[PDB]
Amino acid sequence: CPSGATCGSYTVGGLGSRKQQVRNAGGSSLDLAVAMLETERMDTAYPYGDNKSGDAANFGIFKQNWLMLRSACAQFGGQGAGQYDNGAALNSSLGQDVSCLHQSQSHYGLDAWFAGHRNGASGLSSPNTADIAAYKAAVYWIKAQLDADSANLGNDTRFWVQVPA
Ligand SMILES: [Cl-]
């Protein structure tokens, strides 16, 4: 486990089939790690926008925020913060979700992407915080578990890390 955190793994029914769908939609192991951290079932069943509005609203299985989406992704080009409900298109289309993730990561580079993903504009402007570093470490710990045994790319196991610890 990273730092002083608890971590572990448990079984989620149907998750292996879902992992395969994410991969077939273009998700890499890093993308799977992010998805695995963000929701239990790699879905969009969390509250709409993750109970946030505007630039802070989250959409899709990676919980991408509207600032990131409208700043980097062609389908949201030129849109303002108040148009955030348009990001809900990612809740219905896994292919668009992955496409947007890749556009955003390429636009910012991965290091900046982690910062903006975690903390929005504040994160992009101050990307080297301890909290952002903890988030990144959690994702890469999950990825290490996926990398260490390829069965984890298609089985029902969810790896988890308590990011606040
Ligand atoms: Cl994001």
Given resolution (angstroms): 1.1
* Ligand 1 center to 91 CA (angstroms): 14
Q: Which domain holds residue 8?
A: 1-165
- The total domain count for the chain is 1
Tell me the one-letter amino acid at 84: Y
CB atoms within 10 A of CB 147: 14
Contact between 49 and 42 under an 8 Å Cβ cutoff? The reply is no
* Ligand 1 center to 116 CA (angstroms): 6
Please report how many Cα atoms fall inside a 13 Å half-sphere around the Cα of residue 18, on the Cβ side: 18
Residue with tokens 């896994």: 94
Alpha-carbon gap, residue 1 to 59, rounded angstroms: 28
* Ligand 1 center to 68 CA (angstroms): 5
Dig out the tokens for 163 from the structure.
């990011």
* Ligand 1 center to 17 CA (angstroms): 25
* Ligand 1 center to 7 CA (angstroms): 24
* Ligand 1 center to 156 CA (angstroms): 25
* Ligand 1 center to 114 CA (angstroms): 8
Helix (H) or strand (E) holding 66: helix 66-72
Instruction: Write b or e for each residue in 56-92: b if 16 or more Cβ atoms lie within 10 A of its Cβ, otherwise e.
Output: bbbbbbbbbbbbbbbbbbeebeebeeeebeebebbbe
Angle between helices 29-38 and 15-24 in degrees, nearest 10: 130
